[PDB]
């Protein structure tokens, strides 16, 4: 019922970044995802 | 006084009450402390640019985006000058093929907001970078107050509710008068299983014309 | 295609009756992989995506 999402991004000036979320829904993974802004290079998703 | 008359007629109340004093409170600490979206000056924004009165359409959405430059106190919308979300490019290509209108070279919604469209997310702060960190703190009992108020307009209001947490609002919103235009979320993991097709821009004109009243111009205009 | 790039998916699912099981999926675009998260019925519980360089 709940994960925590975890990013590597790539800005537009090629620096990589990892972003750490916690504690989401599957429905609010689903809209975090439509709201990443930045090229995805990896995606993880964990069950908590 | 927070809001302009029109809402705070209806909402002065809630301001008073423990918990929006304990929001605040939080609120006071952690713009101090972090980074918060949207800037603080911005909370209400869609409020603002939208009053009680002249509500025509509601967008509803759930937390403000997380990161620099993005959010504006309104759902869905970014500041001109960053790149839009994939979302909210779904929405564009959604409007173009519903209305017409091209694709703009930034994606702020403000010109929605000017015209009546209410661009309501349910909770109205982040910390940078932690989606949902500002779940439960208060902003729900809040946002929950301003459906209701807007359920209990004798002029009736049409709610746009895409994916499934917008739609769990169905139950505050009095559908003997209201108008109700539902789909799948426009995140790429749902758009074209509803989202797509479901012409919600013109669906919407439709009902205000039915009532009388003047039509939204949807297209946005590059900057 | 030099053009578009190709990602790597790998889920460990659990299936009504608790059984843990690995899939994997190779080579798929950006699309193909939102369209393979909406056919997943059973519970995700890890879900890796890798974009290949
Ligand atoms: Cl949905």
């Given at each position: 019922?709940?994960?925590?999402?975890?990013?590597?991004?790539?800005?537009?000036?090629?620096?990589?970044?990892?972003?750490?979320?916690?504690?989401?829904?599957?429905?609010?993974?689903?809209?975090?995802?439509?709201?990443?802004?930045?090229?995805?290079?990896?995606?993880?998703?964990?069950?908590? | 006084?927070?809001?302009?008359?029109?809402?705070?007629?209806?909402?002065?109340?809630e301001?008073?009450?423990?918990?929006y004093?304990?929001?605040?409170?939080?609120?006071?600490?952690?713009?101090?402390?972090?980074?918060?979206?949207?800037?603080?000056?911005?909370?209400?924004?869609?409020?603002?640019?939208?009053?009680?009165?002249?509500?025509?359409?509601?967008?509803?959405?759930?937390?403000?985006?997380?990161?620099?430059?993005?959010?504006?106190?309104?759902?869905?919308?970014?500041?001109?000058?960053?790149?839009?979300?994939?979302?909210?490019?779904?929405?564009?290509?959604?409007?173009?093929?519903?209305?017409?209108?091209?694709?703009?070279?930034?994606?702020?919604?403000?010109?929605?907001?000017?015209?009546?469209?209410?661009?309501?997310?349910?909770?109205?702060?982040?910390?940078?970078?932690?989606?949902?960190?500002?779940?439960?703190?208060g902003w729900?009992r809040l946002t929950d107050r301003i459906?209701?108020?807007?359920?209990?307009?004798?002029?009736?209001?049409?709610?746009?509710?895409?994916?499934?947490?917008?739609?769990?609002?169905?139950?505050?919103?009095?559908?003997?008068?209201?108008?109700?235009?539902?789909?799948?979320?426009?995140?790429?993991?749902?758009?074209?299983?509803?989202?797509?097709?479901?012409?919600?821009?013109?669906?919407?004109?439709?009902?205000?014309?039915?009532?009388?009243?003047?039509?939204?111009?949807?297209?946005?205009?590059?900057?």
């Amino acid at each position: 019922d709940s994960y925590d999402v975890t990013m590597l991004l790539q800005d537009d000036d090629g620096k990589q970044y990892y972003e750490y979320h916690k504690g989401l829904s599957l429905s609010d993974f689903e809209v975090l995802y439509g709201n990443t802004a930045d090229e995805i290079i990896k995606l993880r998703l964990d069950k908590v | 006084q927070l809001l302009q008359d029109s809402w705070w007629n209806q909402l002065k109340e809630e301001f008073e009450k423990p918990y929006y004093q304990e929001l605040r409170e939080m609120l006071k600490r952690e713009y101090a402390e972090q980074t918060i979206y949207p800037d603080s000056r911005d909370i209400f924004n869609a409020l603002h640019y939208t009053s009680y009165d002249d509500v025509k359409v509601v967008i509803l959405g759930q937390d403000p985006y997380h990161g620099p430059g993005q959010a504006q106190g309104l759902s869905f919308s970014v500041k001109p000058g960053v790149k839009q979300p994939p979302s909210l490019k779904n929405i564009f290509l959604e409007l173009q093929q519903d209305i017409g209108c091209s694709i703009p070279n930034h994606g702020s919604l403000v010109s929605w907001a000017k015209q009546g469209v209410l661009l309501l997310n349910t909770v109205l702060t982040v910390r940078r970078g932690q989606a949902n960190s500002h779940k439960g703190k208060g902003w729900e009992r809040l946002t929950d107050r301003i459906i209701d108020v807007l359920s209990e307009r004798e002029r009736p209001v049409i709610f746009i509710l895409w994916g499934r947490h917008a739609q769990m609002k169905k139950e505050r919103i009095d559908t003997s008068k209201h108008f109700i235009i539902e789909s799948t979320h426009p995140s790429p993991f749902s758009a074209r299983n509803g989202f797509f097709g479901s012409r919600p821009f013109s669906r919407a004109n439709a009902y205000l014309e039915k009532m009388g009243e003047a039509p939204i111009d949807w297209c946005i205009k590059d900057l």
